[PDB]
Write a protein that binds this ligand. Structure first.
Ligand SMILES: [Cl-]
Lengths: 16, 16
C-alpha cells in the first residue's frame, strides 16, 4: 500500500 | 519538490 502525509497548520494522513 | 495526488469521488493534488 501507499501512505502519504500532508502538512500545511493542518495536517493529514491518507493511505491505500 | 514532491507532488501527491489523492482519489476517494473526491480528488486532490498537493505539492511542495
Ligand atoms: Cl507520496
Amino acid at each position: 500500500a501507499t501512505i502519504a502525509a500532508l502538512l500545511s497548520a493542518s495536517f493529514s494522513t491518507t493511505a491505500v
